[PDB]
């Protein structure tokens, strides 16, 4: 094809035909090609660290001996269920309810989901504090709607026959002896899911923020010993003096059920919380039978995952920064990190220029948009400081002890955040997750070193396509802070509106033309279908603005990178033209013909042949670069174009 007629078919015409989607894939994209390379290059890194033999105390030893304790499943059979019985004896030695709570927190430090979930995030009202959050997790089933809903009555009918068969595999004997205890478990989890919140109530952040003092928590949940619980977690009541109860009416009844239900019913319940947590880290009788309820009955999986697929997922859950640090000493070196800091600084300079020369917004709110970009951070690459795993011992011949110690060095790290203030470069995803977004509550882009891989950012090639590639994905995500979506968020992340009515109306009337452009677009594969499929242009309006504001800034940020010099021409291609060829190669994505019709109904992005082609029609720099005449398919008239920044 011709790039003035079809920019997408010029560089992906040799990819949309002669590349077939594999059978397990729904859609095979360039965003999904990085998922297959961040799961290969992490799996090839922990396999290499197991066959290396580093010194005891380093981090190539610690990931190398945790994965090799999982992959040697013959030594888990030699251990038996005897590592579980030493940890079940902590439940069985508990006479009163005080020692049952302190045994439960020692399980909860070591990786067992207890009765109250614990995570430590920021305050999000103060944001100079780290606070601890007391969620709901007291049930063995994934939702509240597996106990009362009539659709999920097949699961609760098959629930106590699974717990009786798992208790029979631990203590020995037949399932008729343990059907009495497994009916006491479901009768307590039904009483715990009576006070679970719904899914549509849990996302509402007005009732999901209830700041309590620790002296107020003991008077609220009277019937639980909270002091010996958090001491066994690895903290103190003078170390979490204020805390947020995420579900406050759940915590009143759960501590009321801790003192009203008999403690033998709670101890067989707490045995089951230990058994189904440690079920993938035990023998093949307990690995396979726990899959038959949790993968075959619930999710519907025909075969269990392999030992290496759960081996990498054990290392990634326990030590994500240790596998993060070795991913970026091989695949994202500091010459490629220092290359990408200039590119975001040029993108932050092009957003400083284009806001100041802007016409469609108020000059009182134009200075508000410069105050947000001065408060703008960018978590790009890897963190500036790693997390210390030096308090962690990993033995190669003990899989159950490593999971007890790897979950305890993660739980001691997040509960040590309560002493110091907020780092604000904490990096809640590791640098191998392919998830690049914009977080408006704290105002940054989070672009890890897996999205900064080719064909998005090749650091050895010419610098033109890195502005067209990851430099326009970044300007899409910086542009989500200055759109109609980002009008509700200021530079600190609070919910104040820095757009006036005039700005909203002008921005709406400028971007009114994109709805009539995108309503008349049909994917080339779905053109043959008898019922014409049309991109719902009023539904995909928020992402079509941001792809337009992403590319139009990265052409300016390329122009302030050359610093007056002409662009280098490689194989007859201008550097202004090579931004658009790097824009048209980050949407190497095809779908199946059945899934793409479902993509036009519910997916708020456009089809990926119209994120590329339907954005360069409205960019004035596309017409000068490719010499687009009047008789071309992407030739818009210049009065109907949408311009957001230039
Ligand atoms: Zn996106």
UniProtKB/TrEMBL annotation:
It comes from the Bacteria. Keywords: Hydrolase, Metal-binding, Metalloprotease, Protease, Zinc. Its cofactor is Zn(2+). The keyword Hydrolase applies. The keyword Cell membrane does not apply. GO terms for biological process: protein processing. One of its GO terms (cellular component) is plasma membrane. Gene3D superfamilies: Collagenase (Catalytic Domain) (3.40.390.10), Neutral endopeptidase , domain2 (1.10.1380.10). One of its GO terms (molecular function) is metalloendopeptidase activity. Residues 3-383 form the Peptidase M13 N-terminal domain. Residues 435-642 form the Peptidase M13 C-terminal domain. InterPro entries: MetalloPept_cat_dom_sf (IPR024079), Peptidase_M13 (IPR000718), Peptidase_M13_C (IPR018497), Peptidase_M13_dom_2 (IPR042089), Peptidase_M13_N (IPR008753). Belongs to the peptidase M13 family. This is Probable zinc metalloprotease Zmp1.
């Amino acid at each position: 094809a011709r790039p003035q007629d079809d920019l997408f078919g010029h560089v992906n015409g040799r990819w949309l035909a002669e590349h077939e989607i594999p059978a397990d894939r729904a859609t095979d994209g360039a965003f999904r090609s990085l998922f297959d390379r961040a799961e290969t290059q992490v799996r090839d890194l922990i396999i290499q660290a197991s066959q290396a033999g580093a010194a005891v105390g380093t981090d190539a030893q610690r990931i190398g001996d945790l994965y090799a304790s999982f992959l040697d499943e013959e030594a888990v059979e030699r251990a038996g269920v005897q590592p579980l019985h030493d940890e079940l004896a902590t439940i069985d030695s508990a006479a009163d309810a005080t020692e049952l709570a302190a045994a439960l927190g020692t399980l909860q430090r070591a990786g067992v989901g207890g009765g109250i979930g614990v995570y430590v995030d920021t305050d999000s009202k103060d944001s100079t504090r780290y606070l601890v959050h007391f969620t709901q997790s007291g049930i063995g089933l994934p939702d509240e709607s597996y106990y009362r809903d009539e659709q999920h009555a097949a699961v609760l009918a098959a629930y106590p026959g699974h717990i009786a068969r798992m208790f029979g595999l631990v203590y020995g004997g037949e399932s008729r002896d343990h059907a009495k205890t497994a009916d006491r478990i479901v009768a307590l989890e039904t009483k715990l899911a009576d006070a679970h919140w719904d899914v549509v109530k849990r996302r509402d952040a007005d009732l999901g923020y209830n700041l309590r003092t620790f002296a107020q928590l003991q008077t609220e949940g009277a019937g639980f010993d909270w002091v010996s619980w958090v001491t066994a977690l690895g903290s103190a009541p003078d170390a979490m003096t204020e805390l947020v109860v995420r579900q406050p009416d759940y915590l009143v009844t759960f501590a009321s059920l801790w003192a009203s239900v008999n403690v033998e019913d709670w101890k067989c319940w707490a045995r089951w919380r230990l058994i189904r947590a440690r079920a993938p880290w035990l023998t093949r009788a307990l690995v396979a039978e726990d899959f038959e309820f949790y993968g075959r009955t619930l999710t519907g999986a025909q075969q269990l995952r392999d030992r290496w697929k759960r081996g990498v997922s054990l290392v990634e859950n326990l030590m994500g920064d240790a596998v993060g640090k070795l991913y970026v000493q091989r695949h994202f070196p500091p010459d490629a990190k220092s290359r990408i800091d200039t590119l975001v600084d040029n993108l932050q300079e092009a957003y400083r220029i284009s806001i100041s020369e802007l016409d469609w917004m108020t000059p009182q709110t134009r200075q508000r948009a410069l105050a947000k970009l001065n408060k703008f951070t960018a978590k790009v690459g890897y963190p500036i400081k790693w997390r210390d795993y030096s308090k962690l011992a990993i033995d190669r011949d003990d899989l159950y002890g490593n999971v007890q110690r790897g979950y305890a060095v993660n739980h001691d790290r997040e509960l040590a955040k309560l002493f110091g203030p907020v780092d604000r470069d904490e990096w809640f995803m590791t640098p191998q997750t392919v998830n690049a977004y914009y977080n408006p509550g704290m105002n940054e882009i989070v672009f890890p070193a897996a999205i900064l891989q080719p064909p998005f950012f090749d650091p050895q090639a010419d610098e033109a396509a890195n502005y067209g590639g990851i430099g326009a994905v970044i300007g899409h995500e910086i542009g989500h802070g200055f759109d109609d979506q980002g009008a509700k968020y200021d530079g600190d992340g609070n919910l104040v509106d820095w757009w006036t009515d005039d700005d909203r109306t002008e921005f709406a009337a400028r971007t009114k033309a994109l709805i009539e452009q995108y309503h008349a677009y049909t994917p080339r594969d779905l053109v043959d279908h008898p019922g014409p499929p049309h991109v719902q242009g009023a539904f995909t309006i928020g992402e079509n603005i941001g792809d337009l504001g992403g590319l139009s800034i990265a052409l300016l940020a390329y122009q302030l990178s050359l610093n007056g010099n002409p662009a280098p021409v490689i194989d007859g291609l201008t550097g202004m033209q090579r931004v658009f060829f790097g824009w048209a190669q980050i949407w190497r994505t095809k779908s199946r013909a059945a899934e793409a019709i479902r993509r036009l109904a519910v997916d708020p992005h456009s089809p990926p042949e119209f994120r590329c082609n339907g954005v360069v029609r409205n960019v004035d720099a596309f017409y000068q670069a490719f010499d687009v005449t009047e008789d071309d398919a992407l030739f818009l008239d210049p009065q109907r174009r949408v311009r957001i920044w230039n």
